[PDB]
Request: fold
Amino acid sequence: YEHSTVMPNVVGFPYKAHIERPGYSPLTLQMQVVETSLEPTLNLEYITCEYKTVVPSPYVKCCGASECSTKEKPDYQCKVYTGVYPFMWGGAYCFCDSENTQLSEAYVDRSDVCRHDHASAYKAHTASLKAKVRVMYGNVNQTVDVYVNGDHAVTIGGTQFIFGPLSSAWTPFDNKIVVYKDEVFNQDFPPYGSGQPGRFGDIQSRTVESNDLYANTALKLARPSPGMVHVPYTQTPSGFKYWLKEKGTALNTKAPFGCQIKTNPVRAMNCAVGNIPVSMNLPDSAFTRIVEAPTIIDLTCTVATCTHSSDFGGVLTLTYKTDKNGDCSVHSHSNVATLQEATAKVKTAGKVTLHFSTASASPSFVVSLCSARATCSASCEPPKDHIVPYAASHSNVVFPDMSGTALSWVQKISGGLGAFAIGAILVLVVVTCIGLRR
Amino acid sequence: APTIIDLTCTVATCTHSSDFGGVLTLTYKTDKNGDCSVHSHSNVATLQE
Ligand SMILES: *[C@@H]1O[C@H](CO)[C@@H](O[C@@H]2O[C@H](CO)[C@@H](O[C@@H]3O[C@H](CO)[C@@H](O)[C@H](O)[C@@H]3O)[C@H](O)[C@H]2NC(C)=O)[C@H](O)[C@H]1NC(C)=O
Ligand SMILES: *[C@@H]1O[C@H](CO)[C@@H](O[C@@H]2O[C@H](CO)[C@@H](O[C@@H]3O[C@H](CO)[C@@H](O)[C@H](O)[C@@H]3O)[C@H](O)[C@H]2NC(C)=O)[C@H](O)[C@H]1NC(C)=O
Reply:
């Protein structure tokens, strides 16, 4: 039997779906989204880490000159200085007074622990959504894992479920992401091959295991001081370390809608928004024949106490008449009130009680027990407690019924004003028609 | 706590003496037997229990 429903996407919400086959007993289903997962699709841009400056020992040619040679190294630097007179611990070599040459060589290479400590740059698009939902009815429990799109059907005791696409398509990740260890950022990194010294991505490699590298650190060499062999250089500090020191904020501590961010793989967890459509196919054995179920006649509803609090804060009493004792599938036909239970035990005494939760001053809804139906209305008083540690269990609808106290007063005032206005209309029409009849 | 609906009050006898001199009857309809905390919302009458 085909059926369709929509449920809110909030973890822990006790959604109840009511299926009414005319030839059988009504059935009620309890669904609860235990877990969610927002998985974006990622493609690597590059890897970044600290650098290491490699400075080979200077080459001094005594009594001669040497000519600088170029090589293919990342940020390579080569220079020659003339007029050097080196010194050592025992005495100065290069016996010639002033015909000596020092050759300085330097270049930048990826650090040793880049494979253990590095940041990655990513692009994100077309996020997919995965879910884990617990379903209960009759005498079957159980949780299942599904992919939320119209292409995944899971069987649970002979029943086919399909959870259709999400209503919205909102994901906290922008186009470009910076991932570091266990934290995600909404950053705009510069593209490959155009880094800037002193900031993020001064050195960049395509992958962790690729040999190639692009570095840009403004390495400059200086003339050595007289009587020393020390090849002095200057270089802007590593951009990676200053990014660590001043990255600023995060996404773990700023994602909207209250949802966690995790890594490996990057995902957003328990992130409540929108609606999940559900399509259902139930076998003939799931229902119960109308002859087996007890019959209910003369069903009346009353409210003992109401209080629009977060928990289940109203108690309702149903009076009826039955032929035999058994089980009924109670339901509420409005989202103004959410029941606690889906099944009830009817006994020949004829009284049952239920608990419900709502958030309106004047609720009004139709409750059904087995095959019967009745109307319930109530007045509710505010709760006194200011803050609670459990989430609200109502659908958060506030507008009162038209028969509530405030709307009744408004309706009476409007009726009085309208009657007075219509009386004045009649006076004017009568006078003018007397004028015209003459 | 039990639910209480259809509460009606009747007074059998009254006598404004110093001792507890009025007997009152309440009729209701309840789902299960239990305990309630009775009170009077005015100081004209003082309950016993
Ligand atoms: C041992 O030490 C002597 C100096 O005490 C070294 O002699 C020096 O040799 C170099 C090249 O062998 C000379 O450089 C060039 O010499 C030519 C000579 O025509 C000159 O035209 C160039 O402008 C340049 O100076 C250097 O002058 C010379 N020093 C002198 C003559 O005082 C010698 O090389 C050392 N031994 C070895 C094996 O190198
Ligand atoms: C359908 O299955 C779920 C999962 O087993 C049932 O929920 C489980 O209910 C039991 C009984 O209440 C829980 O055991 C108790 O949990 C409390 C929680 O603090 C603990 O203090 C006790 O020591 C005891 O272990 C169990 O934790 C709970 N599990 C989950 C994941 O919710 C559920 O009741 C089943 N449905 C029906 C109708 O029985």
About this structure: Residues A 136, 141 surround ligand 2 (CB under 6 Å).
